[PDB]
Amino acid sequence: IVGGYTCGANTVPYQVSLNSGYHFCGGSLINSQWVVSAAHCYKSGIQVRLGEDNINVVEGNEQFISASKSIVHPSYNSNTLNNDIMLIKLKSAASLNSRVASISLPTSCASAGTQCLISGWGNTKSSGTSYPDVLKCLKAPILSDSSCKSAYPGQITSNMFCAGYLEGGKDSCQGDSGGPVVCSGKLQGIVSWGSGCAQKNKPGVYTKVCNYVSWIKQTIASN
Numbered sequence: 675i676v677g678g679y680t681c682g683a684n685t686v687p688y689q690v691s692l693n694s695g696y697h698f699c700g701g702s703l704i705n706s707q708w709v710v711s712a713a714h715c716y717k718s719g720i721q722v723r724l725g726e727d728n729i730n731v732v733e734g735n736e737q738f739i740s741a742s743k744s745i746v747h748p749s750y751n752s753n754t755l756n757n758d759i760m761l762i763k764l765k766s767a768a769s770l771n772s773r774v775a776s777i778s779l780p781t782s783c784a785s786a787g788t789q790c791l792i793s794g795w796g797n798t799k800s801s802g803t804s805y806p807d808v809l810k811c812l813k814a815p816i817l818s819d820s821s822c823k824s825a826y827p828g829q830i831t832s833n834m835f836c837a838g839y840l841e842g843g844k845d846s847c848q849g850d851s852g853g854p855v856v857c858s859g860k861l862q863g864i865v866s867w868g869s870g871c872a873q874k875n876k877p878g879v880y881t882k883v884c885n886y887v888s889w890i891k892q893t894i895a896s897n
């Protein structure tokens with residue numbers, strides 16, 4: 675997250691870190707056994723780390739649970755990033771408490787202008803590289819479809835939305851991939867892509883979660 679703020683420990687209780695020897699992606703806990711992330715975060719050997727603040731220090735609220743199955747969306751295209759969504763099932767159910775909690779799926783899509791919270795352990799620099807230990811947060815509005823399409827000619831599908839600031843300075847970034855965009859207490863987006871980070875006229879692009887609720891629910895119901 676570039677241009678954000680320190681969230682505060684366990685203030686984003688649905689935020690997960692995906693770990694394969696190191697943090698490599700975020701995700702969102704959606705029930706005691708399932709995490710939503712980006713399809714571009716797929717790899718084998720995932721350990722889901724819940725209750726994290728400092729990802730380099732065991733602070734006492736963590737739960738570390740290995741993935742038993744990952745399911746990349748059937749229509750994910752890794753070239754275009756269309757349908758950039760994945761489900762990860764935990765080997766055992768997370769213990770839910772104030773600091774480890776699931777985030778509700780949307781019942782309806784969110785409109786341009788809606789204020790959201792984006793979070794992660796990604797790069798905090800727009801030029802250069804610095805990776806934080808503690809969770810970073812950014813408040814950002816959803817941008818209009820027309821301005822998203824203007825920013826990224828030929829690249830925005832109906833399964834994507836832009837959020838952030840056309841002036842630059844505030845954005846998600848590398849390492850935030852797969853993490854949450856939460857608006858009015860619902861998971862509306864997944865950190866998907868951009869062109870660099872925090873550049874003028876290049877806002878972050880997010881997977882449009884509301885389009886996938888049926889798929890998520892029926893996948894969970896049979897897996």
Ligand SMILES: FC(F)(F)c1cccc(CN2CCc3[nH]cnc3C2)c1
Nearest residue numbers: 846847848851866867868870871878
């Ligand atoms: F794993 C990487 F690094 F190869 C990768 C591939 C595709 C996408 C991404 C995530 N985006 C990075 C740029 C950006 N700018 C605003 N948001 C993002 C997220 C990472």
Ligand SMILES: [Ca+2]
Nearest residue numbers: 728731732733
């Ligand atoms: Ca920790």
